[PDB]
Amino acid sequence: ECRIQRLTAQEPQYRLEAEAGVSEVWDYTDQQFRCAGVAALRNTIRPQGLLLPVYTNAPKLYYVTQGRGILGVLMPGCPETFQSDQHQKVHHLKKGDIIAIPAGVALWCYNDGDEDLVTVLVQHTASDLNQLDQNPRHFFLAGNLADNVFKGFNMEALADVLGARKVRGQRGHIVRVVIRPICSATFIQNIDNPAEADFYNPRAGRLTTVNSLKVPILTFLQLSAMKGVLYENAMMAPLWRLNANSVVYAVRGEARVQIVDHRGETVFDDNLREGQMVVVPQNFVVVKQAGSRGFEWVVFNTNDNALFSTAAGRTSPLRGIPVGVLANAYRLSQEEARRIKLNRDEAVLFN
Amino acid sequence: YECRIQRLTAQEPQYRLEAEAGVSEVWDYTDQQFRCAGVAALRNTIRPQGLLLPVYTNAPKLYYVTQGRGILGVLMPGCPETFQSDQHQKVHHLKKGDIIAIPAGVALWCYNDGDEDLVTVLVQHTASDLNQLDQNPRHFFLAGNLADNVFKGFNMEALADVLGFTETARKVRGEDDQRGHIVRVEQGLKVIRPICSATFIQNIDNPAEADFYNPRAGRLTTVNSLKVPILTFLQLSAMKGVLYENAMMAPLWRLNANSVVYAVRGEARVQIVDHRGETVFDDNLREGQMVVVPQNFVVVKQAGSRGFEWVVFNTNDNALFSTAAGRTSPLRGIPVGVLANAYRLSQEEARRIKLNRDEAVLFN
Amino acid sequence: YECRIQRLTAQEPQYRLEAEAGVSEVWDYTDQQFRCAGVAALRNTIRPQGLLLPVYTNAPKLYYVTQGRGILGVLMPGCPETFQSDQHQKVHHLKKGDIIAIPAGVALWCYNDGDEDLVTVLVQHTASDLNQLDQNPRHFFLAGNLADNVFKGFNMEALADVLGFTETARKVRGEDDQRGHIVRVEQGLKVIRPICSATFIQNIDNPAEADFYNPRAGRLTTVNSLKVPILTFLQLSAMKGVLYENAMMAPLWRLNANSVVYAVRGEARVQIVDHRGETVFDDNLREGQMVVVPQNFVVVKQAGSRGFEWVVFNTNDNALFSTAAGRTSPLRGIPVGVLANAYRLSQEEARRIKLNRDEAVLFN
Amino acid sequence: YECRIQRLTAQEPQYRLEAEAGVSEVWDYTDQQFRCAGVAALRNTIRPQGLLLPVYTNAPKLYYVTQGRGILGVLMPGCPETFQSDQHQKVHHLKKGDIIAIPAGVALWCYNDGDEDLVTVLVQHTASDLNQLDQNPRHFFLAGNLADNVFKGFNMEALADVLGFTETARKVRGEDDQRGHIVRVEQGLKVIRPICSATFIQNIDNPAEADFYNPRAGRLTTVNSLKVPILTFLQLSAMKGVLYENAMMAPLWRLNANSVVYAVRGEARVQIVDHRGETVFDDNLREGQMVVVPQNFVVVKQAGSRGFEWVVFNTNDNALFSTAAGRTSPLRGIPVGVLANAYRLSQEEARRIKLNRDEAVLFN
Amino acid sequence: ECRIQRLTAQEPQYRLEAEAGVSEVWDYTDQQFRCAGVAALRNTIRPQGLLLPVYTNAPKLYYVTQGRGILGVLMPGCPETFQSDQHQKVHHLKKGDIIAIPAGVALWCYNDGDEDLVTVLVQHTASDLNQLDQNPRHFFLAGNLADNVFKGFNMEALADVLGARKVRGQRGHIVRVVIRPICSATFIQNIDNPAEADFYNPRAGRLTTVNSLKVPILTFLQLSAMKGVLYENAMMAPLWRLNANSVVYAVRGEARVQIVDHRGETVFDDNLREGQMVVVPQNFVVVKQAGSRGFEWVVFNTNDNALFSTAAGRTSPLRGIPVGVLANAYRLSQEEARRIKLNRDEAVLFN
């Protein structure tokens, strides 16, 4: 399931055009995603576009690559706290936001901005919360792997449950053209803003994480994400993730990216570029050196608490264990063990 | 502590502590009104370019940034420095409407990199099991001015022995300063940018990020455990409330917490009712004032001609309230018959008591 | 609070509160015996067709229904109505032998749809961290009669403004009633049937649902966290005990709780022993009496000629006891040698001290 | 309880309780110094072949075995006997440097099968929510000598009725003994070998099992929740510290606990500093002495010419400290500018304050 | 996956020789282990042997069969509390120790003793912490299913992250030839010592357990172990484990061992001998009668809290339910139901 000889920088493989947008779907059936147990989507919502309400059998983490809009989530059996129409609290979407949506909860979204609203999506199909298959399934309540639920039911059986029903809706799933244009849980979190970075080096870059200790619901989703920015010529320390697979999506720039497994054979050594998506399995080691225009990425991780282990750096295992072990391991002399030890004073982002 | 209170009173700070670059206004933590709540209220004003010396306390704290913009630095124990150019821990940008949560014992400093006074109102939960001292606020300062820094009572020789610096650098210590706890700065003061990754900021006053909304009554924004995880450890919470012209906040009692209302803007007619069915409070609250609504006490607010904006520090992890009237009120939960037999009214009268107010918590 | 008690006493209610349709009997929550336990004991008698006005308190409560049958209504905050024909929340049928758990701050009413007096005995855990007021019981009533309802101290204009009803419906409020807290009814009063799905009832007196049984000694039925989940939040528990003719409850001390024994039926010789090895209690308990066995204090009961049936309110989530004598006693856990050297007896004497009583907790 | 202390003092036991085979030395649990910490300190010396009679208390306990080797027996409630040849529960071998954790209410005995006095120092956390009595230690003894065993105040007839043994075996009880709480033995006394599988022992003084080490400064060994699970239930912890010749323990304050330092070996210059920046302690601690460093109070130790070995009982599940100076100190966490503006020093002076001491907690 | 007609006493199937030791690997692809979802290894480290640092995608429980040495574990981003060189706290290994190592954390080990350091190892591949495959994977940082990671990366990309790099190390993984020759968590626990036994019978034997209520980290590993000793002619009560599979490794002596499944057919009835490894699936029932020289074993269990159910004995289900049920079940008379009930006063170890 995860015996992989090589890794791939992937882009969508089939499109899904609608009236007011497009859904580009990665081949979740490729071995790169099968192993990661994720399904990668991209949603583009033109101005005035409305994504019809949908729910999925699996948890979901959206990232807002571009645009600004309004979002509406539906928790079961909770009153409406927005009353003028009466409905639940809509949410404000802005570039750099992370959205966590549980499995089975309905969500709609509308693009009330002048720029295309681009959101990248991963669906964790290997999560215990998903009790169906390891393939994406979208239950729509309108419109139209995916389809509109309301369709299936009878005209009359459904007639006498409510006082008529063309809720059996081909405009696609994003159509053209609210009060403000448990259940008090925070689902949005700013990740792309610089002021709220976690790691920072004015010469190397910055790292911002979202996880269970920032957004509580993630404890239930067992997902997380990291927004990374590398300036020109800076590099990311070589690292492996202890308890999760990684879904890296390149949002800007270019960077050389290398990946290694147990057998010591490199499965990936290529230039990642904006719009591409690479997967870094668990315990596989990455390393990035930004290109000429820097590099910016988002990595989706499949665990509540994503820990890293940097082969080299201030918080590096090599820095942790004795010089003797280093010398006897890598034959060279005591002082070049010290060299491999205490020469990089930086943590994980480097000049 | 006892809470048999006959009278609640709107209270202003009772004793000030001025520094060269700021002023601390301390409410009377001795007053029964707050001793019941188990909290100590503080208000810090930091003029532009002012620096609070690092400090930690025996009790958890919830700061609310009423005004200004500035830098903050918290010091988690045994955490590496993630900000390197100087190499230090993550500083954070606080700004108007921010809620800041500071666990007990953590050292923390703040700087005002803005052109306006940085006003932060804070409460220190002194009745928390984390505070293992007594019901009195205690600030341990790491510099200057809580009489002098804790380095004052130390021995210069020992502190030199330890700091790797004897050394007239020994002037790290106290009784030779007189600038206070908020000092004036030379240049800037968070110079990389002016567990350990835990979120401590939460913007609460963002209109677009309200929890209850009514375009003609107001809005309510909460911060609790399901917003910020650390609060589950602090067992503290807060709510930022805005009422529009002549609107009203339903009569409500909080189930599992005391509440500390700080009047931010406007004025409002406020009534508070106790078990005895008697009124313990009936006054017009105005900005800068602080009242406590003890647990289960019923409070109601009708905003004045200029609206009313308040912040409430609640003393539990998940402070939830029950409203006597509204769409989610007990009256709606109980049968009509109960209403009739209770208030001795006709079934239609009860049905009016029960089903005429279609709104949730904020009304006209 | 201090618990250095020289003498435990069997206690009856000290002051009654009569209504037109019932009577409240209040034990002296001021008495040291209960102040040590941190509880306030109450007994409500509701004559047929009587209605308790809805009410909520600052402390959790464990009701025990000694007699009768009636309807109950609890009011969870912000929960939709699941009973619709009127539309309201789930009412529940309480009946003889029921344990009812009511969290702090929740409103609740009760009606006696039976032909016999509905007798409920209740304890209010005033030493719980959920009670953030003081060690005094406080009932907040939503109607009539805790001097008047909390609607009394409010302003008729405001309560009219809010309730969507000014309105001489304003008579929702107090000081104009005089019927008390338990009133007489017109017809019936739970009229659909005379989180939010949490179980609050637990029948404990069901003989077929005992935990310890001996057809000649008696039976013991517990209710704790692994029976009812909410108790994990209340940190309260209870045990319903029945001893047959001349049987005995082993001498036992509870590890992690105080115990509040209410004598339901029969009489029994009861002895209670403290750290000092001295007897703090040595009397014949009889129905309607209430005693407290503080934590770690050793108690033993020998039932009289008519058996003895009691209920104990324990003040922890999982109240477990250790019996000085029995099949699961410390003596069996320690080696014989220890017994010999401790009591200075021959190894056979110790082996008798240790292995002759083959029963668990209920004996002959 | 109040902790506004003007002066901390090194304290020795104030009243002894001698037995035929041992002596109990009791620190003054009445003294404010300990009443602030919420603990009662005890020291038991058991001469070879001495037996402590089984006993349980209202509060959790952390024993530290300073000297000797002996057998222990704990009595978990309702657990079968796993040691059978006699059939009884698992006895455990305690030896020099052991930490023993005893939950409240559990009975426990100990025997000295060695040729040297068995010295155990213990603290009883009286401010724990598990102790539901008062802030006073209370030992309930199951044999002899806490005035007599709890079997004393019982009725011989009842205790005969129950024990399956009337019987002049009734001499299981008190006021006829006079040997005390530590008695002399005939032969041996754990004779199979001289939930319920929970670890209660933790060797802390093992040099090879330190957490901090410096071959020229010393070593530090902790025991907390991530070492022994039961502590998560006791919310107690401990630290065994050794400082070599003329070494120093950094100036540190504990965030979330009071600390109880028992001087085991050597002497050391100790200074303690409070919020007021004033010195509350400045003396040379020596073996057998006991001091309390309240929460957030800053303490520093410089060992004498013969080193210094101490044990600290901390009153929380995960007691973590923050050191004013060191590699993991707040000063390193805050920017240089903050240091300069705080102590009014040049950026290089601050960089010295901040980056010259490359060690963690133990220094030269 | 676990429909098994018979069970096997297994020994390693392929060796891995190094300069200063040997790694003997059980065939984790046999159906006996597939079902148990474990991989069994044996490490032998000659005097002065050093096991190069490694990390694995799965949790691990080592048992120290023989020898005495020093061990070094690397937790992410935790300071060095051993300072003279500066590094993390090494640990002392001695015969009878149990070591729990999470997935993804690096560990090295060195044999500073005069006797061969023999450690037996199980890796729980069916643990949710492992997000790769159900096959062992060893990521080394030095040397060389298994391989050295540092190998894979480029000479220069890795050059400019630290000031040279022959950290790209054939001596094997254990090579010939420290300050003392969250992150304060206990990973070692004494299990083989008699004084700390859980069950004991001076005539039958003794049982010592390690589980979540002894070592806290196991709560996260969901593993556990039991060290068992049976004297000559004593026998282990027949038992089944409720919530885990069992990996029994025979460390000394010989014993007849029988195993039964649901169908009542015996899948194993043979003499287990030192150095052999048998697996007892969940709810399969074992029974052991020691041979002439007694018997000593370690069983690795796949759960935080391993509970047993002894068909016969003081704490036996048969002792739990009424004599009537026994009689009506097994026809014979009321008093021979009593006989099957209350004749074995011992718990689980028997004469």
Short mmCIF file of all heavy atoms in Angstrom, two decimals, chain D residues 81-84 87 192-193 199 201 211-215 226-227 229 327 360, chain E residues 79-81 83 86 89 184 186 194 196 198-200 202 214 216 314 345 347:
data_model
loop_
_atom_site.label_atom_id
_atom_site.label_comp_id
_atom_site.label_asym_id
_atom_site.label_seq_id
_atom_site.Cartn_x
_atom_site.Cartn_y
_atom_site.Cartn_z
N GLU D 81 -5.92 -11.67 46.15
CA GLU D 81 -4.56 -11.87 46.64
C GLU D 81 -3.73 -12.58 45.58
O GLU D 81 -4.11 -13.66 45.12
CB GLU D 81 -4.58 -12.68 47.93
CG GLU D 81 -5.46 -12.09 49.02
CD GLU D 81 -6.91 -12.48 48.87
OE1 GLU D 81 -7.24 -13.66 49.15
OE2 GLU D 81 -7.72 -11.63 48.45
N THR D 82 -2.61 -11.98 45.19
CA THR D 82 -1.74 -12.55 44.16
C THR D 82 -0.52 -13.24 44.73
O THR D 82 0.25 -13.84 43.97
CB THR D 82 -1.29 -11.46 43.19
OG1 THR D 82 -0.47 -10.51 43.89
CG2 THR D 82 -2.49 -10.75 42.58
N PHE D 83 -0.30 -13.16 46.04
CA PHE D 83 0.81 -13.83 46.70
C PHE D 83 0.24 -14.97 47.54
O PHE D 83 -0.47 -14.73 48.52
CB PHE D 83 1.60 -12.85 47.57
CG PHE D 83 2.58 -12.01 46.80
CD1 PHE D 83 2.26 -11.50 45.56
CD2 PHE D 83 3.83 -11.73 47.33
CE1 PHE D 83 3.16 -10.74 44.85
CE2 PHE D 83 4.74 -10.97 46.63
CZ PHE D 83 4.40 -10.47 45.39
N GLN D 84 0.55 -16.20 47.14
CA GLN D 84 0.00 -17.37 47.79
C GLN D 84 1.09 -18.41 48.00
O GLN D 84 1.94 -18.61 47.12
CB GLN D 84 -1.14 -17.97 46.96
CG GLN D 84 -1.94 -16.94 46.17
CD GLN D 84 -3.24 -17.48 45.63
OE1 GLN D 84 -3.81 -18.43 46.18
NE2 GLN D 84 -3.73 -16.89 44.54
N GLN D 87 -1.95 -16.54 51.88
CA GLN D 87 -2.48 -15.93 50.67
C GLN D 87 -2.79 -14.47 50.95
O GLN D 87 -3.67 -14.17 51.76
CB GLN D 87 -3.73 -16.66 50.19
CG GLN D 87 -4.42 -16.03 48.99
CD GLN D 87 -5.64 -16.80 48.50
OE1 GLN D 87 -6.36 -16.34 47.61
NE2 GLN D 87 -5.90 -17.97 49.08
N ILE D 192 5.65 -14.63 52.46
CA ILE D 192 5.77 -15.21 51.13
C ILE D 192 7.10 -14.80 50.52
O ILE D 192 7.82 -15.62 49.94
CB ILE D 192 4.58 -14.83 50.23
CG1 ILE D 192 3.27 -15.36 50.83
CG2 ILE D 192 4.77 -15.37 48.84
CD1 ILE D 192 3.22 -16.87 50.98
N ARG D 193 7.46 -13.52 50.64
CA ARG D 193 8.82 -13.10 50.32
C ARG D 193 9.19 -11.87 51.13
O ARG D 193 8.62 -10.79 50.93
CB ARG D 193 8.96 -12.81 48.82
CG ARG D 193 9.11 -14.07 48.00
CD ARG D 193 9.84 -13.81 46.71
NE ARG D 193 9.21 -12.74 45.94
CZ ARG D 193 9.48 -12.46 44.68
NH1 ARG D 193 10.38 -13.18 44.01
NH2 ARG D 193 8.86 -11.47 44.07
N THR D 199 1.98 0.71 39.84
CA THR D 199 3.29 0.94 40.43
C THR D 199 3.19 2.03 41.49
O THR D 199 2.63 3.10 41.25
CB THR D 199 4.30 1.34 39.36
OG1 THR D 199 4.33 0.34 38.33
CG2 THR D 199 5.70 1.47 39.95
N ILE D 201 6.22 2.25 43.75
CA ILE D 201 7.62 2.54 44.04
C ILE D 201 8.22 3.28 42.85
O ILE D 201 7.82 3.08 41.70
CB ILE D 201 8.42 1.26 44.37
CG1 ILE D 201 8.70 0.41 43.12
CG2 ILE D 201 7.67 0.41 45.38
CD1 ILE D 201 9.84 -0.57 43.30
N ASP D 211 18.00 12.94 35.37
CA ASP D 211 17.41 13.67 34.25
C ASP D 211 18.29 14.83 33.79
O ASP D 211 18.42 15.05 32.58
CB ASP D 211 16.03 14.21 34.65
CG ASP D 211 15.06 13.10 35.00
OD1 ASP D 211 14.62 12.38 34.08
OD2 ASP D 211 14.73 12.94 36.19
N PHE D 212 18.87 15.57 34.72
CA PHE D 212 19.92 16.54 34.44
C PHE D 212 21.22 16.00 34.99
O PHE D 212 21.25 15.44 36.09
CB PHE D 212 19.62 17.90 35.07
CG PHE D 212 18.29 18.47 34.70
CD1 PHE D 212 17.14 18.02 35.32
CD2 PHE D 212 18.20 19.46 33.75
CE1 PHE D 212 15.91 18.54 34.98
CE2 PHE D 212 16.97 19.99 33.41
CZ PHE D 212 15.82 19.53 34.03
N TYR D 213 22.30 16.17 34.25
CA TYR D 213 23.60 15.74 34.74
C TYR D 213 24.69 16.71 34.31
O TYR D 213 24.66 17.26 33.20
CB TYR D 213 23.96 14.34 34.25
CG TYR D 213 25.28 13.85 34.79
CD1 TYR D 213 25.48 13.66 36.15
CD2 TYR D 213 26.34 13.58 33.94
CE1 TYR D 213 26.69 13.22 36.65
CE2 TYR D 213 27.56 13.14 34.43
CZ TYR D 213 27.73 12.96 35.78
OH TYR D 213 28.94 12.52 36.26
N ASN D 214 25.63 16.92 35.21
CA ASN D 214 26.86 17.66 34.96
C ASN D 214 27.93 17.05 35.86
O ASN D 214 27.86 17.19 37.08
CB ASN D 214 26.68 19.15 35.24
CG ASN D 214 27.97 19.94 35.10
OD1 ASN D 214 29.07 19.40 35.17
ND2 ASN D 214 27.83 21.25 34.90
N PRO D 215 28.94 16.36 35.30
CA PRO D 215 29.88 15.62 36.16
C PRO D 215 30.62 16.49 37.16
O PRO D 215 31.26 15.95 38.06
CB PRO D 215 30.85 14.99 35.15
CG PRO D 215 30.73 15.82 33.92
CD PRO D 215 29.31 16.28 33.88
N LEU D 226 4.68 11.49 34.13
CA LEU D 226 5.24 10.72 33.03
C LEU D 226 6.29 9.72 33.48
O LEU D 226 6.89 9.04 32.64
CB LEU D 226 5.83 11.67 31.98
CG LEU D 226 4.76 12.27 31.07
CD1 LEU D 226 4.97 13.76 30.91
CD2 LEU D 226 4.76 11.59 29.70
N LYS D 227 6.53 9.61 34.79
CA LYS D 227 7.33 8.54 35.36
C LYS D 227 6.46 7.50 36.04
O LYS D 227 6.58 6.30 35.76
CB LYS D 227 8.34 9.10 36.37
CG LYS D 227 9.09 10.34 35.92
CD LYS D 227 10.25 10.03 35.01
CE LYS D 227 11.28 11.14 35.06
NZ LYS D 227 12.44 10.88 34.17
N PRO D 229 2.40 6.63 36.86
CA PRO D 229 1.05 7.09 36.50
C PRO D 229 0.23 7.54 37.69
O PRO D 229 -0.51 8.53 37.59
CB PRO D 229 0.42 5.87 35.82
CG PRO D 229 1.57 5.01 35.43
CD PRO D 229 2.60 5.22 36.48
N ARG D 327 20.55 28.13 30.25
CA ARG D 327 20.30 27.95 28.83
C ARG D 327 18.81 27.90 28.52
O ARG D 327 18.41 28.18 27.39
CB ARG D 327 20.97 26.67 28.33
CG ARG D 327 20.69 26.39 26.87
CD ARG D 327 21.67 25.39 26.32
NE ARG D 327 21.59 24.11 27.02
CZ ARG D 327 20.69 23.17 26.75
NH1 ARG D 327 19.80 23.34 25.79
NH2 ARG D 327 20.70 22.04 27.44
N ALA D 360 22.47 24.41 31.83
CA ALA D 360 21.03 24.35 31.99
C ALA D 360 20.57 24.82 33.37
O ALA D 360 20.06 25.94 33.50
CB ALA D 360 20.52 22.93 31.74
N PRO E 79 15.88 20.24 25.02
CA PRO E 79 17.27 20.59 25.31
C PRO E 79 18.07 19.39 25.79
O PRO E 79 17.53 18.32 26.10
CB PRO E 79 17.16 21.67 26.39
CG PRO E 79 15.82 21.45 27.01
CD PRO E 79 14.94 20.95 25.91
N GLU E 80 19.38 19.58 25.86
CA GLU E 80 20.31 18.55 26.31
C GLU E 80 20.59 18.76 27.79
O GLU E 80 21.15 19.79 28.18
CB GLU E 80 21.61 18.60 25.51
CG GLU E 80 21.43 18.49 24.01
CD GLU E 80 20.89 19.76 23.39
OE1 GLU E 80 21.68 20.67 23.09
OE2 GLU E 80 19.65 19.85 23.22
N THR E 81 20.21 17.79 28.61
CA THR E 81 20.36 17.90 30.06
C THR E 81 21.59 17.16 30.57
O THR E 81 21.78 17.07 31.79
CB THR E 81 19.12 17.37 30.76
OG1 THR E 81 19.08 15.94 30.66
CG2 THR E 81 17.87 17.95 30.12
N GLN E 83 25.54 17.55 30.24
CA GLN E 83 26.53 18.50 29.77
C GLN E 83 27.81 18.33 30.56
O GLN E 83 27.79 18.27 31.79
CB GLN E 83 26.02 19.94 29.91
CG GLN E 83 24.51 20.08 29.76
CD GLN E 83 24.07 21.53 29.64
OE1 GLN E 83 24.86 22.40 29.28
NE2 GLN E 83 22.81 21.79 29.94
N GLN E 86 27.69 17.92 25.03
CA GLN E 86 26.34 18.25 25.48
C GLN E 86 25.35 17.42 24.67
O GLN E 86 25.36 17.46 23.44
CB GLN E 86 26.08 19.75 25.30
CG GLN E 86 24.65 20.18 25.57
CD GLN E 86 24.46 21.68 25.41
OE1 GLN E 86 25.42 22.45 25.50
NE2 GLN E 86 23.23 22.09 25.17
N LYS E 89 19.98 12.64 27.91
CA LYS E 89 20.29 11.65 28.93
C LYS E 89 20.35 10.26 28.31
O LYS E 89 19.34 9.76 27.80
CB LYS E 89 19.26 11.71 30.05
CG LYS E 89 17.85 11.36 29.62
CD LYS E 89 16.86 11.75 30.70
CE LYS E 89 15.73 10.75 30.83
NZ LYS E 89 15.01 10.92 32.12
N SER E 184 11.11 14.08 29.66
CA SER E 184 11.54 13.44 30.89
C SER E 184 10.73 12.19 31.18
O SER E 184 10.50 11.85 32.35
CB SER E 184 11.45 14.42 32.06
OG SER E 184 10.10 14.64 32.43
N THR E 186 9.76 8.18 31.35
CA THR E 186 10.44 6.92 31.62
C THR E 186 10.19 5.95 30.47
O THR E 186 9.04 5.64 30.15
CB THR E 186 9.95 6.32 32.94
OG1 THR E 186 10.23 7.23 34.02
CG2 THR E 186 10.64 4.98 33.23
N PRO E 194 12.82 -10.44 40.42
CA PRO E 194 11.79 -11.14 41.19
C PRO E 194 11.10 -10.24 42.20
O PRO E 194 9.88 -10.34 42.37
CB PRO E 194 12.57 -12.27 41.88
CG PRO E 194 13.98 -12.21 41.34
CD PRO E 194 14.17 -10.82 40.87
N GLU E 196 9.95 -7.47 42.21
CA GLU E 196 8.87 -6.64 41.68
C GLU E 196 7.89 -7.47 40.86
O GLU E 196 7.33 -7.00 39.87
CB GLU E 196 9.43 -5.49 40.86
CG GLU E 196 10.03 -4.39 41.71
CD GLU E 196 11.04 -3.54 40.97
OE1 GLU E 196 11.19 -3.73 39.74
OE2 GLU E 196 11.70 -2.70 41.61
N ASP E 198 4.32 -9.41 40.09
CA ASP E 198 2.92 -9.10 40.32
C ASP E 198 2.17 -10.29 40.93
O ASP E 198 1.48 -10.13 41.94
CB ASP E 198 2.26 -8.69 39.00
CG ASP E 198 2.93 -7.49 38.37
OD1 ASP E 198 3.52 -6.67 39.11
OD2 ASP E 198 2.89 -7.36 37.13
N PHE E 199 2.32 -11.47 40.34
CA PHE E 199 1.80 -12.70 40.90
C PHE E 199 2.98 -13.57 41.32
O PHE E 199 4.02 -13.56 40.67
CB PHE E 199 0.94 -13.45 39.89
CG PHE E 199 -0.17 -12.62 39.33
CD1 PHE E 199 0.06 -11.77 38.27
CD2 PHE E 199 -1.44 -12.69 39.87
CE1 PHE E 199 -0.96 -11.01 37.75
CE2 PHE E 199 -2.46 -11.92 39.36
CZ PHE E 199 -2.22 -11.08 38.29
N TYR E 200 2.81 -14.31 42.42
CA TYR E 200 3.89 -15.14 42.91
C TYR E 200 3.34 -16.35 43.63
O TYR E 200 2.35 -16.27 44.36
CB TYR E 200 4.82 -14.37 43.84
CG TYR E 200 5.90 -15.24 44.43
CD1 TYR E 200 6.89 -15.78 43.63
CD2 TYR E 200 5.92 -15.53 45.78
CE1 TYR E 200 7.88 -16.58 44.16
CE2 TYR E 200 6.90 -16.33 46.32
CZ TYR E 200 7.87 -16.85 45.51
OH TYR E 200 8.85 -17.64 46.05
N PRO E 202 5.67 -19.49 45.53
CA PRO E 202 7.01 -20.07 45.70
C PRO E 202 7.13 -21.47 45.13
O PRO E 202 8.26 -21.94 44.94
CB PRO E 202 7.22 -20.07 47.22
CG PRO E 202 5.86 -19.99 47.80
CD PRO E 202 5.03 -19.21 46.83
N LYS E 214 1.95 1.15 34.64
CA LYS E 214 3.32 1.16 35.13
C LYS E 214 4.19 2.14 34.36
O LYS E 214 4.89 2.96 34.97
CB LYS E 214 3.93 -0.25 35.08
CG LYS E 214 3.21 -1.27 35.96
CD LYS E 214 4.03 -2.54 36.13
CE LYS E 214 5.24 -2.35 37.03
NZ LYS E 214 5.08 -3.04 38.35
N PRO E 216 3.87 5.19 31.69
CA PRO E 216 2.81 6.01 31.07
C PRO E 216 2.85 6.05 29.55
O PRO E 216 1.79 6.03 28.91
CB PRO E 216 3.01 7.40 31.68
CG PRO E 216 4.34 7.36 32.38
CD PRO E 216 4.59 5.94 32.74
N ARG E 314 -8.70 -19.32 40.82
CA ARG E 314 -9.37 -18.45 41.78
C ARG E 314 -10.13 -17.34 41.08
O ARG E 314 -11.26 -17.00 41.46
CB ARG E 314 -8.35 -17.88 42.76
CG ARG E 314 -8.93 -16.89 43.76
CD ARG E 314 -7.86 -16.37 44.69
NE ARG E 314 -8.36 -15.31 45.56
CZ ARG E 314 -9.00 -15.51 46.70
NH1 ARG E 314 -9.23 -16.74 47.13
NH2 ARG E 314 -9.42 -14.48 47.42
N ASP E 345 -7.57 -23.38 44.56
CA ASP E 345 -7.52 -22.13 45.30
C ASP E 345 -6.48 -21.17 44.75
O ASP E 345 -6.43 -20.02 45.19
CB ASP E 345 -7.23 -22.41 46.78
CG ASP E 345 -7.56 -21.22 47.66
OD1 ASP E 345 -8.12 -20.23 47.15
OD2 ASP E 345 -7.26 -21.29 48.88
N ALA E 347 -4.47 -18.83 41.82
CA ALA E 347 -4.98 -17.85 40.86
C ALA E 347 -4.71 -18.29 39.42
O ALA E 347 -5.64 -18.64 38.69
CB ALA E 347 -4.37 -16.48 41.15
#
